[model samples]
Target: NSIIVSPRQRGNPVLKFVRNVPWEFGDVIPDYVLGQSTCALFLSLRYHNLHPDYIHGRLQSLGKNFALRVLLVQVDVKDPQQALKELAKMCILADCTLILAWSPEEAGRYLETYKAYEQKPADLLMEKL
Candidate 1:
């Protein structure tokens, strides 16, 4: 059993599974910010039905393993620099790493660092910068 948290009506069962477990700010950060929306883990965990007791146990184990406090804050701003500063301040206050992505250069750097790739491909076939 596992606990899942998501937006709207999207992953009720998974959220229910994880609801009783202690949620720390750290444990949820990487998943929530980086991987959750795009990855299979979110999909699989969200859909797989697990026993409540089992989910509770699993979430408890995760809590123990990570001992993290994850803070997810969304701020809307028209300026990129201001947004970056806001994110940095938030991370500093929360004592967590701040991850902000902007521009094709940043995206390329991220892909190079994380995925070991360095090609900048357009989102659309005909679009080029």
Candidate 2:
């Protein structure tokens, strides 16, 4: 089984994913955000299908002004080298950091980090500046 979560719309913080989602080319990339100081995790227990082009497109759509945009993915694929190569290429094209975890248990540890990014501060950086 595969699970994918995507932002509801541009500039929206909400994320949506269907139950029992499939691991297929068309279903790989859903609506998602494209920029700035945000982090998201894509988790799956095993190797699954994902479209590289679709992922590249989403990354290309992001604005250039973001301080940080992280994509943390966890999967245990049979061929570690090939998977890492592909994932690295995607991250390079997207200009985002990619953290890969091999185990689901290890992956769950990042939940708090995601929550930290998801929770916005009371004021924008400019306000403090």
Candidate 3:
């Protein structure tokens, strides 16, 4: 009996809230972007910090393939100032621009919480636990 469908998540008023930005799905890049032209790339300080060529090559291949590219970054270390400059210059060179951020704890989030499930039978819950 470890099942509990909490109230208030039905239409998940967070529905409209999470639409904070209207990004769609994409190709190798993953997130298709705003009004339709941009592509989002994952470039955290942690990954490219070691494998500089990883992002550089991806950027190389996609060069001029896209116009406005966005990069998502995560702060996992204390020494990211230099990393910022490096990424900054790279983005400065490539037309692939835009650097984004991320934060600490993300549990109070709304990903799967707002995905493909909407039915009256809350009892679909009875089997999972």
Candidate 4:
């Protein structure tokens, strides 16, 4: 038996298709922002070392066209400016306001583990044979 994985199910299909879209931040950006619906973007910034006040500032400064709500899965970096910049770029191309949502370190950790499992070599189990 074989399994099939498709890219369309990953990120926002529409935004993913846009040209010059900045996806350097990877799935965490899209999955957290537009991909998630329950969390607040304010909390998402914490993992990336962003305080609520600073995150709020970044959110306020973003362009009006960036779409997709943000959900923070990891916030360990010392500087969020770079992430914010890329997010802003994604916003411009998305043509909607970007939203921010946060997840706690614990949750982010688990999510990372899950993503890791998903991306791991499919034959890892077989390799152990």
Candidate 5:
């Protein structure tokens, strides 16, 4: 079941998916701005069926300025392997890493977690020699 939350100005599903992340509409084309030089593009495979080659158009719109480019794709189709393979290659060409999520909630969680640690320091996980 889709998680429900109090509606914002609009009932955007993406908005509901994200809970702790602070976001606002702006001129940026990227769906998410994880950091100053990090961004994420979302593509649902179920939607990919209707419009193949959709990601290229989106990447072109997104451009290649960000240092870290993440492609968070949702796999809701029966045979998503072929679609993901194509997307994997596309990501290679676009210099973006394709991260697949099985559910919308997972995608939303990733987005929220990524942003929560956007400004995190690496020291915590590093072993000082």
Candidate 6:
């Protein structure tokens, strides 16, 4: 006799650890924001060593219409103003919104702000009805 057992039932170690946890859909940027706002780009750097050519190529590949929402993470560099100014120039070219968050808590706060702005017209209309 042959027997079949599901992975979840057969004590799959990976599944066992993750099964009970509530997973956040990290990839799901709000549709309204996606249409109206720039695409977010997260960069965590220990130094001000950004390459202009690489960035230019990346922006070219993404196309002119695909604007940027730049989030600078773990940024602890000297002359922060200069670094920001340099980044700002690139942001101007791409029509990007620049945000600087030093910690995870700060990042979460920014994320909340973005989420608060994410609303659908249909939902508002439905609410009125």
TM-score of every model?
Answer: 0.27, 0.50, 0.54, 0.25, 0.78, 0.51
Clashing pairs in 3: none
Off by over 4 Å in 3: 1-35, 104-129
Badly placed stretches (over 4 Å) of model 5 are 1-12, 119-129
- What is the clash count for each candidate, in the order shown? 13, 1, 0, 23, 0, 0
Best by lDDT: 5
Lowest-lDDT window of 10 residues in candidate 3? 1-10
Candidate 6 residue lDDT tens string, 9-123: 2322222222222223233232112223334444434433564354445444445453335443345565577666777787777666667877545644444455444333246
Error of 4 at 103 (Å): 3.2
Give candidate 1 regions above 4 Å deviation: 1-5, 8-78, 103-129
lDDT order of candidates, top first = 5, 3, 2, 6, 4, 1
| Model 4 Cα lDDT, one tens digit per residue, 12-46 | 22223222322223333222332222111323444
Q: Top model by TM-score, which number?
A: 5
Shift of residue 115 alpha carbon in model 4, Å: 23
Worst 10 residues of 6 by lDDT: 1-10
Task: Tell me how candidate 6 scores on lDDT.
Answer: 0.43
Winner on TM-score between 3 and 5 is 5
Q: What is the lDDT of residue 125 in candidate 4?
A: 72
Candidate 5, 10-109: lDDT as tens digits: 3435666777766665556677777766778877888788888777898887787877788989888997999989899889998997888888778888
Q: Weakest 10 consecutive residues, lDDT, candidate 2?
A: 10-19
